[PDB]
Amino acid sequence: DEKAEKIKNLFNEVHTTGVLVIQQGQTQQSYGNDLARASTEYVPASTFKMLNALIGLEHHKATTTEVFKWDGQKRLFPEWEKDMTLGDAMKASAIPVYQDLARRIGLELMSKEVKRVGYGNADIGTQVDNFWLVGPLKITPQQEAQFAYKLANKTLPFSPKVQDEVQSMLFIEEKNGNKIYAKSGWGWDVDPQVGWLTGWVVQPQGNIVAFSLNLEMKKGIPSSVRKEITYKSLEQLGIL
C-alpha cells in the first residue's frame, strides 16, 4: 500500500495525472494518481519507433549500419538535420527518419505487421507516415508494458537477431548494476498531449522488469518529468 501511495504522490507533485505500469512475469501492477489511464488508449508517438524498427529490420527495409540521409528540407529541430542511423534516430526521436522507414515499409506491409503483432488497436488508417503521431493508432500503457516485456525477453513475433538489434538501440545506461532500456514519447499534436516512457530494467542476476509511464503533458510540464518520475518510482519499488 505504501509504495503505491508514494508513487501516487510523485505524480501529484508534478501537477498532472499519470500512471506507471510495471510487468514482471505475466502479471502487471499499476501505480500513480490516475490508475484508469493504464487501460486507456493513447497515441504511441515515438514509442512506436520500437515496432517500426523491428518491422523494418525484419523485412529488409533497413539495416543497423545504413545512414538515413537528410535531404536538406527543414526539419522540426536543427539537431535532426543530419544523416543518421536507425539507432541514432531512435536516441534522437528523429521523426523524419522513421517516416522515411515507414514509407519504405509501405501501408500494406505496415498494416499487416501491426495487426499480426496485435499492437494497440492495430489501426493505422490510410496515411503511412503519421499514424503513430496523430492517430488512428492507439495503445494502452498496459499494452506498452507488455510489449516492452516481450521485447526484453525476445518473445515478440520477430527473429531474435532483430529483437537484439532493437534492444541495443534502446539502451540508456547501467545504474547500480541495472541495465536500463527505454523509449520516450510525446504526442504533442493531440489534445490533451500524452507523455510516455516505456522500457525495462535488467537487474544484476538477469531478472527483467518492464515498465510504461504514461502521463498528461500539460503546459508547463517539463519533458524531463517522464524520466524523473520513472526512475524515482522504480527506486521506491526496489527495482533500481
Automatic annotation (TrEMBL):
Q: Which SUPFAM superfamilies match?
A: beta-lactamase/transpeptidase-like
Q: What is this protein called?
A: Beta-lactamase
Q: Report the PROSITE patterns cross-referenced here.
A: PROKAR_LIPOPROTEIN
Location of the Penicillin-binding protein transpeptidase domain: 15-234
Keyword Signal listed: yes
Is the keyword Magnesium in the record? no
Annotated GO molecular function terms are: penicillin binding
Q: Which UniProt keywords apply?
A: Signal
The modified positions for N6-carboxylysine read K49
